[model samples]
Target chain A: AEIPKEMLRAQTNAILLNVLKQGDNYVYGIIKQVKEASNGEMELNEATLYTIFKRLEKDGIISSYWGDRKYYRLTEIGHENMRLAFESWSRVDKIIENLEAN
Target chain B: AEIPKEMLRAQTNAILLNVLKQGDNYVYGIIKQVKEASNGEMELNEATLYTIFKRLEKDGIISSYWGDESQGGRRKYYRLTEIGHENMRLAFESWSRVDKIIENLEANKK
Candidate 1:
């Protein structure tokens, strides 16, 4: 079944960040990890990954280097943001839970 | 700070559905609950709430009726259909599901 596009779009950043949070990863590995995380619900293409890569790098969430593998590594800020993303979503969850309890 | 627009958009349907789940609400009343729920992080404008109500009505998830003069003159109040209640139930479960998914994904485990 297809994941909801709206949820998918909102999650793309968090998924990518989590993949990086695992450890340094190359482009291909990131795509693979996203597939694993979503149980194949999410598929990524290089161009889209690159787009987010550029955006993340611009925001200093990730930095890249050409080592043994062409790796995209999380910066200190990226670690901070991964938590922030959770906190943000956690707040949303609380909002939903409160409504359900009502 | 501001919540992400994309996240907020995805939740709008569930939010509105849940709002009406509590009780029937007019446009202004719906907007009021949204502010309370989001803790001021989200404030809904009438136009947007109207748009959501229109779509919800069209989809048959919700139906509307005009109130008598007693409550507040002739205001259109919205109530959930059975389908909407079921839908809201699912939406509620899904957010909790998504919460677990986020926790797992954010974990440092393999």
Candidate 2:
């Protein structure tokens, strides 16, 4: 199934948070993780990925460190934000389930 | 739960189709059904619903007919065409696949 671009943008925060939850990673690394996580359904290009990275960092949800290359990791706020997003997503998951069943 | 506007619009076709699947319904009714379906997390205002309604009708996925005036002032009811049903199936399939990816990410299973 092809994921819509709207959905891709909608889940950007959660997707980034999930990738960083694995470990600190640079831009290319995060891109790879998201691609794998989505089973190649979400191969984000560099520009889009960078935009999200900058936004997350700006919001203080993620912090970047210059270690060899710029690596990003979830801050404490990031972890909390992801948790809240997940909880909200669970609500959406139910609706999708209902829609499917019907 | 707060669904992003993009996600809400992304799912509009599917939601509308699902609502009409039960039976023909007017705009206000569809709006209420969607809100209830998502447990109040996905509410489509009248303007937004009307916009989507026009698009769907124009695309030939759904067709509309004016119902009795007593049923809320000449309510325009919408029903799905065959194409609508096919598109709804595709939408459901899309969501199923996306759900798998979301599960994988959430659990860090892959």
Candidate 3:
């Protein structure tokens, strides 16, 4: 099958963006957290995760500083974006309660 | 594992954002497209897709309108936020070119 692998790439990129918001983390840390957090459900390979980290760092949603590990934290923009995301999430959850009832 | 679960949720949220930009797709449409695009490699259930749609719609990153579909009554469409388009693009560019630059181990090559 001639698959559009780009979709998976895109999805991986998106997840990497939010993962940065959790804290300053390294690639290994991100992978560990993703695996632990998803309870073995959220599957991702190291290559895809690194690609995402590279891209998000490029995008400015995240910035890396050299620490014990190559740590990544959300930029000012990332923080603001996540704040907005939380608000939007709350709104959606509220609405879905109604939608589900109907 | 007493899982946090939020990490996966966050990742899922991010993909949902891009999936919207691929086109003005509805929930079911997005799911079908995602499955088709990944060739079943990228997996998502219906509930998660709707959850993402509701969230993105609330975020103002996407706007939804009704579309006529024969079976589902009205399907909602989604569009991108200008902010999303601009920031997500080149911010993903500048450093990637250099980072993938193979190696910098020539401590004396400069």
Candidate 4:
């Protein structure tokens, strides 16, 4: 089944951070990684991805530099935020498991 | 952590059907069963619970009857119809797909 758009958005920041955590990367690479990570289940439009990147950079959750390529990196705050997001996802997973065990 | 209200609502019918599958039950016990099922992670207000019951009954997913007070305090008990079971299974399947995708994403992040 296709994942809900809102559900996908909820994980957008954490997924982006996870992608950038491996190395500083440009938009196309990050988009590619997101699709690959989700095993092609998530196909984000370029405009939407760019909008998220712009919002994150503006909010200081990520920093971008224009070198040979435009690269985005998580700020310290972004890293911490992603960690919290991971924790939240873990908690929700556990909660669902508990619910299903009944 | 508390499940998002929308997330809870998404599975509301399934939860209700599962609770009724064990036996016929009334509103208060249904509420309790759901809370316990989620390990107290989810709580629905009485009004919301009633609204869901009404909706389910109207949709024919579940049927309800009032028990005589002589046997027990007058209570409206509910049980799943065949369609209810089918819907519950579909809900489970739908959520399973979502969980698998989420797990895959998390695994790749590692």
Candidate 5:
């Protein structure tokens, strides 16, 4: 299982986006669902998720607040952002090629 | 040939990122290349591209400046910032899984 660092990084972003797509949930809930769906591949610590969470929040890609465990959900911008991201990903073969080219 | 709106929007993002990954280019160049790569699927207007470009720049995901063109408007030369590179990878994987789910559900009809 040799995971290329760049590919792993790409997978991590995919995992995060999936977690956020799960709708408003506490931090723990996001972690739980992401691990479950990724089958434990997307290993993330509390500190890491929150730090990235804060960055996304600052960019208005997502919004969150205390909801038993601090809920996280896409803002309108987040939804649009995710949609745009999804569009970009549809060309995976091209993306992989591009990444490899780099 | 049913195109799902949500899916189209998603694909468009992927195309944009792919084009951006080609390195710094002027706005028209990016659009021209995107259309070529997406097989004419990822249509983009100058205004639309510029608007998204501005937002990404504002978010610090990208940086840009004027190039040779300066008439009706100054041409932009944009490149993804470090954070942009970091974020793009994560977003792509998440997208594939969700897309798979939708694709399968479509197939199963269950």
Candidate 6:
């Protein structure tokens, strides 16, 4: 079954932030890491990857540099945003668990 | 901590679809039920709930029907089509994977 695009898109921001949290990576490297982390369950094409990069970079959540290639890393603001996103995801997950249990 | 609007909005669709999966629940009932289910952690205002309903209807995942006002309620839409059920199923699966990915990343960072 295919996950709805809307759901995937919303979580994409968090996914990228989490991956970048480990270290800096270019588009392909970030996508590769995500695939591995998801155990090959998730795949991202360059188009979607760049689109997210543009959006995040614009908001100062992520910044890029020309090191061997266009490498992306989180700025201070980016780290703060990622931290908030991580916490928010936990809250959302908790609610889902509670909803099912009750 | 407060959730970012985009992140919260993204999961809202799955949340509502899952709620509708159990049975046909009206707007108010669904809102109340979700609040109860989440232990009051989730709240859907009138405007937000209606907005989601419209989107679902437009996407053909759900439709509405009048519940006979004489039955002691206004027009409520809680009906789920086959697509809605399938969507929720995939949605649940995706969410599980997302959790795993995040957890793995969290562990590795340590």
The runs of at least 3 residues in candidate 6 whose Cα sits more than 4 Å from the true structure, single-residue gaps closed, are A1-3, A67-69, A79-85, B1-4, B71-75, B87-89
lDDT winner between candidates 1 and 5: 1
Worst 10 residues of 6 chain B by lDDT: B1-10
Specify the highest-TM-score model's number.
6
Top-lDDT structure, candidate number: 6
The superposed Cα distance between candidate 5 and the true structure at residue B16, in angstroms, equals 1.7
The lowest-lDDT stretch of 10 consecutive residues in candidate 2 chain A is: A1-10
Q: Give TM per candidate.
A: 0.59, 0.62, 0.42, 0.52, 0.47, 0.83
Better of 3 and 5 by TM-score: 5
Q: What's the TM for chain B in candidate 6?
A: 0.82
Candidate that would win on DockQ: 6
Query: Model 4: which residue pairs collide?
Result: none
Ranking by TM-score: 6, 2, 1, 4, 5, 3
Q: Model 5 - which docking category?
A: incorrect
Model 6 per-residue lDDT at A14: 73
Tens digit of per-residue lDDT, candidate 5, span B5-89: 3334334445566667778877788777766655676558988777667766765667887776756767668887677767666
TM-score of 1: 0.59
| C-alpha lDDT of residue B72 in model 3 | 50
For residue B49, model 6's alpha carbon misses the true position, in angstroms, by: 0.4
C-alpha RMSD in Å of predicted model 1 compared with the true structure: 5.5
Note the residue pairs that clash in candidate 2.
Answer: none
User: What is candidate 5's lDDT per residue for A1-102, written digit by digit as tens?
Assistant: 111233344445555655566556666766665555555555478887888678777877778887535678878867766675465555655643544454
The CAPRI class of candidate 3 is incorrect
lDDT of 3 by residue, B1-110 (tens): 00113334543554565566556677777666555544564567888777666765564556677776677576667776786555445423322221122122111112
Task: Locate the minimum summed-lDDT window of 10 residues in model 6 chain A.
Answer: A1-10
Question: Model 1 off-target regions past 4 Å?
Answer: A1-88, B1-5, B69-72, B85-91
Docking quality of model 6: it rates as acceptable
Off by over 4 Å in 2: A1-5, A21-23, A78-85, B1-24, B35-65, B70-72, B78-94, B106-110
* Alpha carbon lDDT of each predicted model: 0.69, 0.68, 0.52, 0.63, 0.60, 0.75
